[PDB]
């Protein structure tokens, strides 16, 4: 029903999804410029079970980490958020070349690529009824920047042998995601939403100021998937992430001071 095809792609999406024409659409072009320091923005730490892992993924748009979520094992909570998020997967968005990929943007600079951990919020009962609340979901966003290998992902890029075409899974446990988290937790905050179909408005989006390094070599790994079936001629899945999308009336909050711009 959608894709990152030419007939299935960010182009399309409006006509098919009506949400993908809102007014709080993601991802936005971040201005440093035009984003106001807020003191009440505190800190957000997580309590990640490795053991919570469950499946890999290639569902032919990206790859994703699947993570128990039935009841609250890997959480994340403080920052802007109302009250604790489950931790339910975390997949990527990147382009054909190191010079692009990522979904956000900051000051013009664009990364390799992006990755979402998306969590939602346990008081909405169920993760079906968490996409039908304006902060259902939170999705912590971490840039991906050229530079050293990364021992940490290496792990992770190790397993796509397993989930090279579309469709295919495999039980992948024992895994912290927040082994991949930078140093520094600054971060910046804003309402958007799903930058996939159906597009529903309900993330509290948290994009983490400090980007992760990998090497270009990890990266032609990523680029290694396919997005088509075991069987269909072989498709490389690449340049699965969607344009910037007018920010409107949004206001995006730092958590932390950034001097440079004034005084
Ligand atoms: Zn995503």
């Not at 948290?206 to 001629?233: C, F, G, H, I, W």
Request: hydrophobic fraction near 30%.
């Amino acid at each position: 029903e959608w894709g990152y095809a030419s007939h299935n792609g960010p182009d399309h999406w409006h006509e098919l999804f009506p949400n993908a024409k809102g007014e709080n659409q993601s991802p936005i072009e971040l201005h440093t410029k035009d984003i106001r320091h807020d003191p009440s923005l505190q800190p957000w730490s997580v309590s990640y079970d490795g053991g919570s892992a469950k499946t890999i993924l290639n569902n032919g748009k990206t790859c994703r980490v699947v993570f128990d979520d039935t009841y609250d094992r890997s959480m994340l909570r403080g920052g802007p958020l109302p009250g604790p998020y489950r931790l339910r997967q975390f997949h990527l968005h990147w382009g054909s070349s190191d010079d692009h990929g990522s979904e956000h943007t900051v000051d013009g600079v664009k990364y390799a690529a992006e990755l979402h951990l998306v969590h939602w919020n346990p008081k909405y009962n169920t993760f079906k009824e968490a996409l039908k609340q304006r902060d259902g979901i939170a999705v912590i966003g971490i840039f991906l920047k050229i530079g050293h290998e990364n021992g940490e992902f290496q792990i992770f890029l190790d397993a796509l042998d397993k989930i090279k075409t579309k469709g295919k899974e495999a039980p992948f446990t024992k895994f912290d995601p927040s082994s991949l988290f930078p140093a520094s937790r600054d971060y910046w905050t804003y309402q958007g939403s799903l930058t996939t179909p159906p597009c529903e408005e309900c993330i509290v989006w948290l994009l983490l100021k400090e980007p992760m390094t990998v090497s270009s070599d990890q990266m032609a790994k990523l680029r290694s998937l396919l997005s088509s079936a075991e069987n269909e001629p072989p498709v490389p899945l690449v340049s699965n992430w969607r344009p910037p999308q007018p920010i409107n009336n949004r206001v995006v909050r730092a958590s932390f001071k950034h001097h440079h711009h004034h005084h």
